[PDB]
Amino acid sequence: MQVESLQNLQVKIRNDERNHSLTKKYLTDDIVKKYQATKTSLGGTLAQCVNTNAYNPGALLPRSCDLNAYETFRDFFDAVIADYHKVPDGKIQHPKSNFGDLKSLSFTDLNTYGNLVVSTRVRLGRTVEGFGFGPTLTKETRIELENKISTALHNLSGEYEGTYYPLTGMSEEDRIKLVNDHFLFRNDDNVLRDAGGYIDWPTGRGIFINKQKNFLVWINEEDHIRVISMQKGGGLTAVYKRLADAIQELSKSLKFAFNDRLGFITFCPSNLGTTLRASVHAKIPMLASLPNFKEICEKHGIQPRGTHGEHTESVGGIYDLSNKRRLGLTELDAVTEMHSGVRALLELEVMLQEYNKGAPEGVMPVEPLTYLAKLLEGASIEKCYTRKYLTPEIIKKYDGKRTTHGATLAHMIRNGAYNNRSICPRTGEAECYSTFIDYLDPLICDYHGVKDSAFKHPAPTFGDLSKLPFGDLDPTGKFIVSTRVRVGRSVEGFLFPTIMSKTDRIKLEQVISGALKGLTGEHAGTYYPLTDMKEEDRKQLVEDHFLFKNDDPVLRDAGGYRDWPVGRGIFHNNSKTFLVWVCEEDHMRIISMQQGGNLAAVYKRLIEGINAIGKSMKFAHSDKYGYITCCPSNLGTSMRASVLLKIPKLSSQPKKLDEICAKYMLQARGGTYDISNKRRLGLTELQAAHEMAEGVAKMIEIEKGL
Ligand SMILES: NC(=[NH2+])NCCC[C@H](N)C(=O)O
């Protein structure tokens, strides 16, 4: 196989913005310098290994010119392998092959868990010693290898008796039939093509099928041998035993390449070690729809792959689920990982299907409350409010209860269940604060340091916007880089961004954007829908650090990025001093900000904007808690006023710093600090903003003191 110089290929791979391969990561100048003239014992080069990466930027891994590539270019491949297979300290190792005690081995049938499994399949691969891969084979040696292998296959007994079909000479009718039965491989993978996989096509290649059509062998498709056992249903035990028996028998005839670092050598580094991929095709539509579906699988040792194109338009939810591990465990370990993980996932699909019977369409499905309560046990019952008030009696009372529009207690603890450092829940709608009052009210009281009162929450008390008790906290040069006040708001009648449906989001966005497009004067601006945005607008939003990404795991697992990015957007005025985020965590975050320390002007602009928006919709409001928001941490005023404060001196006596913050009820985050009022509930908007001002005024006058 003739390919470009390694240095050329490196430049191509590096200059390609679409390429994010591990090949790109580890094919360094030093690596090129070391290996650009080196040949394996079969005469292969590193250029031949990385060639496909130069032309296929989507490819993650190199391939190998022959089995000696891993040793010959070890500094490169060990780095790639350690990275891909997540090998701890680059301490790559692999145990001797062990399929287990076949006579006594037994796994439960996977269809026990809801009868969701269409089929079960286990695959392995082998390299025959003494022969190269695609780039280093000759036409003759590939055929010699094929002959060696078909002869070994012809010698399998009973169960494995069947027919060898060489590709060469195969009629097009047989070709059509065999690909229709999914027994035949084709030359249709460009990554494989550019790694030398189809040289001298179709010679030296073929397939073998037994009479029962549950055992299938590919010769020289990519690896020397790929062996596949398969059948309808969930009989993993039989599939795996059938596979194990055959390869053990074949081993008596063929010498397979193995070393105690990588295990069984394969053409692609992803399939080293056991080479084993045990899998099922399963119907798991509800599980597949969870926001952290992928993470859930990985945590159970499972890798999911979509099967789109393989089924009808109205039947998706069918996935391939396999062991995620190949290297660093035995075959028995790997199929056990598969069985255990898949069993857990199918049991979870069954639980989802049952717990969400009757729930509104488009509303986020949720795991059973008691399941999530177990995951939440990893949270500190001392710092995590979500767990602290989730008592046995609360679980018993509220399990299986829904609000009128479908919100559950399970919904609201989910973010904590899957992110144990998260300390507050995320509610599903305003009604949550009465339907689940026994959970939420003590939690709220605890978080905000308050207690049950006979009196209605104070009405919105914004103050006289022409005679405010604060002005410019820093007229002079700089203690204050910038000032900001924001509030959260929920719109009456809508489920919150956690669980709301796609149609809900679309309607919400029509209500809110309609109001925003009508704002005038200082508040006049432009709405930028995340769905229909001009790219230059998109770039500029990112430039200004006006971000709205689906990248927070806490929000994600509460469901806040579902049906992305429909109904989401950013509004701001031309000056970028008044902005609204639409449907992130709350229906709205309404924000006023500007350079300098003029809090009175930021506050005034904010209040006038809230009022203007409020003309077109009713804000969710509570006699108990004031303005209602998704997170209970942001009730009452839902107001956060803040400054970007430069205090080089005081930040270096940091506990007469963290003591002001304490006694003036401020929060600080990093001599430049972001300082904000900590209180939200139990005070008026005016007091909230005044507390920040008084606290910041103290800090500043403390600062000049040093
Ligand atoms: N046997 C194989 N086809 N291996 C290819 C695995 C794909 C690989 N992770 C890549 O993107 O390079």
Side-chain angles (χ1 to χ4, degrees), residues 468-520:
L468 294 161
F470 44 78
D472 190 330
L473 314 181
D474 182 50
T476 78
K478 259 123 161 160
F479 287 91
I480 297 171
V481 177
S482 62
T483 306
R484 185 189 185 263
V485 188
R486 66 87 173 145
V487 293
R489 291 289 182 273
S490 302
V491 175
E492 274 188 15
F494 292 88
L495 294 182
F496 291 170
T498 45
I499 70 171
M500 67 195 302
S501 77
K502 182 170 118 174
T503 294
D504 293 340
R505 297 198 198 264
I506 296 171
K507 177 149 192 178
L508 179 67
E509 178 188 44
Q510 292 168 354
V511 165
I512 290 175
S513 65
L516 300 180
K517 297 171 181 186
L519 294 171
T520 68

Side-chain angles (χ1 to χ4, degrees), residues 50-69:
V50 297
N51 190 70
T52 201
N53 296 116
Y55 303 110
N56 302 93
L60 191 61
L61 294 178
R63 301 292 186 275
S64 46
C65 56
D66 57 73
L67 62 93
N68 297 109

Side-chain angles (χ1 to χ4, degrees), residues 58-61 63 84 222 226 268 270-271:
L60 191 61
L61 294 178
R63 301 292 186 275
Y84 183 82
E222 164 174 311
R226 192 167 303 309
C268 177
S270 65
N271 286 313

